[PDB]
Design a protein around this ligand. Structure first.
Ligand SMILES: O=C(CNc1ccccc1)N[C@@H](C(=O)NO)c1ccc(-c2cc(F)c(F)c(F)c2)cc1
Ligand SMILES: [Mg+2]
Ligand SMILES: [Mg+2]
Ligand SMILES: [Mg+2]
Ligand SMILES: [Mg+2]
Ligand SMILES: [Mg+2]
Ligand SMILES: [Zn+2]
Length: 889
């Protein structure tokens, strides 16, 4: 079990200058011939030449056209090809090889594989070595000349990186295409695609050089009608990079390709971006609303990599957050600008503070630049991506837009065409910082701790107001809990975007202000503050921290109603809910523990309920924001605040709070559900795939949230509304009708109706599976067995498996059944999946990430299943390493 250490980075003793590939796809095998034009680097010390090569069948290998002989001159152990140094030339030489691989049976979806009838590659991070021999690491930059051949009837469309420079016929019904890609690239950005693909295309003219760029979007023929939105999103992405960052695409063509079988969302292979079909394809008749934001963000994300990852690439994999954190940040800026809805930023914060905060307080906790790894497939985490994105966003908060753009351009201009490290980016930001502060003594050395220190900081506040002096003080403290990565945690550079709200009229009392907290504690004083303010803290969620605002619920209500910042309003609401949840949770827990025959629960604050009503009834307030305020915080957010969390007690706590609020507001909810119908379900543009209205989609979100609240409440005759909702043309609506009908005897009638609506579109059927999996059904285990027998079967498609099982694992009452039967079920699925796709097997482990935060009985139950999976003799490297880390072995 080889551990790679960040501090051990050393350049290779070799250079690979040119790659010339011939990939010949046949019925039962694929033959890969490769010539590498190589050289000896200045770091060489006479070592053996060792290539990565995993699962390759060697036909021959040669150096300078002399066939090498196994045993005497090289050894191969299915992982490394070692050429003994006595046979390695001392000057420029050619290494060639012919190997056989088998994409048809490559169900792990790394390297070269078959997805339905498409041959497709996935090489990030270390998958190129499953295609041919290489020094498979991103600092080995080379030129590529790639020829693909295949049966012409089965595979008429051939694609790789670069320019297609030849197309030719081959005897026996075959054909070939040659692709030359002269710019240097790392091998993880290599890609090849072969299939019977159909496309949409357009021409984009760049903003400054006025270059014509051909844009192509590809899918299997059945789904070509679902490509239109992706093409629009690509045009939008190109314009945003031009408009915000001044960056234009440099190549003549950009291809996007959807495949059905994909481990993640999409991949930024140079000029040949490859997508999970669920993140590229949509139509209004066959997709839920969520698909439209997903395609926009994933198309944008892969496009933004062309600069932040492709043109400026990574020195080594420890720098992953340099391209992923920065590209997620660029993707989020883009998405916020395109949607023009406050819920876009709120949705990102919601994900961070539930999923990523849980990870950062789990045994898996790591900084955004870890110190070591064993599995590279396990290295791709919400910490590296989403905390990384918040760390890259804090630079923008600190610098402001003008100086951020200046620093970002310094980064691009200095590193374009080269590998880079996190320090290179911090250095570029620091030059901007010196400019903004007007002294070359300023530095961002402390900022680097955001890359090395794991765990979530806690920031807490105390206040003081002197009415006679008109002087206001904010006392701030920061603290990070020690963990396995640092025994002593250092103070970070924390930017705190702040406003001060006048509680009498709701107005801003100071200009835009970002406090720079760089010590364990500091006191920030404001003069000429005419009345005691309510502070608006961490506007926009300006640092990835636990905020302890120390405000009363009365103060939080005033911010919720009258503050200018969407996040602080949403967070104030969140904090009111959390105070209520923790109180009622403890009251329910004590009654359970003490076996009480009677007890009292503290009711929900009536003025809070009044404020929710006030906002809901405001016709000028945002429908998406409204949907957030009527929803309790996510379970995975709540769990960060409770030790030994009893999931039944939490389910009872949530049920009480929702019933308390609904008992007061259900008539408001119903009136709104009806009044929103006309605008929410407007069909004017239903047959225009280019017309996407994020505000309208947010009104549907609000309607479907309200319908869920009313159905759980058994609001009088709400089943009539449910049935009518099932007839809506919009899948978001008619799939909602299935889930909310769970509380009625019509559930299985709607189950069958929506199945019939879904079964003939692959992606819609997966959305149907998720809806079933998520259904609040007491017979959910029996239902899951029915899905297994009738729909899922032995599919190896990750989208199918994830759709059936992951939503169910969020069922607080049923997945965490005290028998442990839910833990048993998902562990059986993980073990079964691990036989053919270890990466996806580790994704299915997600519900176990909180195991040591549950009550002691459920801890034991989860740990038992995890130890059972660890005892499987055939466990993958991925799954073993993951579960060993997660269980603190
Ligand atoms: O789709 C997404 C969504 N985010 C996300 C996914 C997973 C974890 C954390 C964040 N993220 C992609 C990206 O960043 N695209 O730009 C991405 C992610 C992973 C690999 C990859 C694939 C493999 F098959 C591997 F074996 C491997 F090691 C890595 C490729 C692309
Ligand atoms: Mg093999
Ligand atoms: Mg323009
Ligand atoms: Mg995203
Ligand atoms: Mg299928
Ligand atoms: Mg540990
Ligand atoms: Zn990415």
């Amino acid at each position: 079990p080889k551990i790679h250490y960040r501090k051990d980075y050393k350049p290779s003793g070799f250079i690979i200058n040119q790659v010339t590939l011939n990939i010949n796809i046949h019925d039962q095998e694929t033959i890969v011939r490769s010539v590498l034009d190589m050289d000896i680097s200045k770091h060489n010390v006479g070592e053996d030449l060792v290539f990565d090569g995993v699962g390759l069948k060697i036909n021959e290998i040669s150096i300078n056209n002399k066939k090498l002989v196994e045993g005497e001159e090289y050894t191969y152990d299915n992982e490394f090809l070692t050429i003994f140094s006595k046979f390695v030339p001392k000057s420029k030489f050619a290494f060639s090889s012919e190997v056989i691989i088998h994409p048809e049976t490559n169900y792990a979806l790394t390297g070269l594989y078959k997805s339905k009838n498409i041959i497709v590659s996935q090489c990030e991070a270390t998958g190129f070595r499953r295609i041919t021999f290489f020094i498979d690491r991103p600092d080995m930059m080379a030129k590529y000349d790639v020829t693909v051949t295949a049966d012409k009837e089965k595979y008429p469309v051939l694609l790789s990186n670069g320019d297609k420079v030849n197309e030719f016929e081959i005897p026996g019904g075959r054909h070939g295409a040659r692709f030359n890609d002269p710019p240097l690239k790392p091998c993880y950005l290599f890609a090849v695609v072969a299939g019977d693909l159909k496309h949409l295309s357009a021409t984009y003219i760049t903003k400054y050089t006025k270059k014509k760029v051909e844009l192509y979007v590809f899918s299997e023929e059945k789904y070509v009608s679902k490509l239109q939105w992706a093409l629009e999103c690509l045009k939008k992405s190109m314009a945003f990079d031009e408009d915000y960052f001044g960056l234009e695409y440099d190549l003549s063509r950009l291809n996007l390709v959807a495949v059905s079988d994909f481990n993640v969302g999409a991949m930024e292979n140079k000029g040949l971006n490859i997508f999970n079909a669920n993140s590229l394809l949509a139509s209004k008749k066959n997709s839920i609303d969520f698909s439209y934001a997903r395609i926009l963000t994933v198309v944008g994300h892969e496009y933004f990599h062309q600069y932040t990852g492709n043109r400026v690439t990574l020195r080594d994999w420890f720098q992953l957050t340099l391209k992923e954190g920065l590209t997620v940040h660029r993707e989020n800026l883009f998405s916020e600008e395109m949607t023009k809805t406050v819920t876009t930023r709120l949705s990102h914060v919601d994900l961070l503070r539930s999923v990523q905060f849980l990870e950062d307080s789990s045994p898996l906790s790591h900084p955004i630049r870890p110190e070591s790894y064993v599995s590279m497939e396990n290295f791709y985490t919400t910490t590296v991506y989403d905390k990384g994105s918040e760390v890259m966003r804090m630079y923008l908060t600190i610098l402001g837009e003008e100086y951020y753009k200046k620093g970002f351009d310094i980064y691009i201009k200095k590193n374009d065409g080269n590998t880079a490290t996190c320090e290179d980016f911090n250095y570029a930001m620091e030059q901007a910082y010196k400019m903004k502060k007007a002294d070359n003594s300023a530095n961002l050395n402390q900022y680097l701790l955001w890359f090395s220190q794991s765990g979530t900081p806690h920031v807490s506040f105390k206040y003081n107001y002197d009415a006679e002096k008109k002087q206001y003080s904010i006392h701030v403290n920061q603290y990070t809990k020690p963990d396995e990565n640092q025994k002593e945690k250092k103070p970070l550079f924390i930017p705190i975007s702040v406003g001060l709200i006048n509680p009498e009229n709701g107005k801003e009392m100071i200009s835009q202000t970002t406090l720079e907290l760089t010590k364990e504690s500091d006191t920030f004083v404001f003069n000429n503050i005419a009345v005691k303010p309510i502070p608006s803290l961490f506007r926009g969620f300006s640092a990835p921290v636990y905020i302890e605002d120390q405000l009363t619920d009365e103060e939080r209500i005033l911010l919720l109603k009258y503050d200018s910042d969407a996040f602080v309003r949403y967070n104030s609401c969140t904090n009111i809910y959390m105070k209520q949840i923790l109180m009622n949770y403890n009251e329910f827990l004590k009654a359970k523990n003490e076996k009480l025959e009677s007890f009292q629960l503290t009711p929900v604050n009536a003025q809070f309920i009044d404020a929710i009503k006030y906002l809901l009834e405001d016709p000028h307030a945002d429908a998406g924001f409204k949907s957030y305020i009527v929803s309790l915080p996510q379970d995975r957010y709540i769990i960060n605040f409770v030790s030994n969390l009893d999931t039944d007690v939490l389910a009872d706590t949530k049920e009480y709070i929702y019933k308390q609020i609904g008992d007061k507001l259900n008539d408001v909810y119903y009136k709104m559900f009806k009044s929103l119908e006309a605008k929410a379900d407007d069909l004017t543009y239903f047959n225009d795939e280019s017309h996407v209205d994020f505000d309208q989609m947010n009104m549907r979100t609000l309607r479907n949230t309200l319908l869920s609240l009313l159905s759980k409440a058994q609001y009088p005759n709400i089943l009539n509304e449910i049935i009518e909702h099932s007839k809506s043309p919009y899948p978001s609506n008619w799939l909602t009708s299935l889930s909310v009908s769970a509380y009625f005897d019509k559930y299985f009638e709607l189950y069958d109706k929506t199945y019939k609506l879904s079964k003939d579109d692959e992606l819609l059927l997966q959305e149907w599976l998720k809806t079933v999996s998520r259904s609040d059904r007491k017979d959910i285990y029996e239902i899951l067995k029915k899905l297994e027998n009738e729909v899922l079967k032995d599919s190896k498609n990750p989208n199918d498996i994830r759709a059936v099982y992951l939503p169910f694992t969020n069922n607080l009452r049923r997945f965490h059944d005290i028998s442990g039967k839910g833990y048993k079920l998902i562990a059986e699925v993980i073990t079964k999946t691990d036989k053919f796709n270890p990466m996806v097997a580790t994704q299915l482990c997600e519900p176990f990430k909180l195991w040591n935060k549950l009550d002691t009985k459920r801890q034991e139950l989860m740990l038992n299943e995890m130890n059972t999976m660890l005892q499987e003799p055939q466990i993958s490297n991925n799954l073993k390493e993951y579960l060993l880390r997660l269980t603190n072995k």
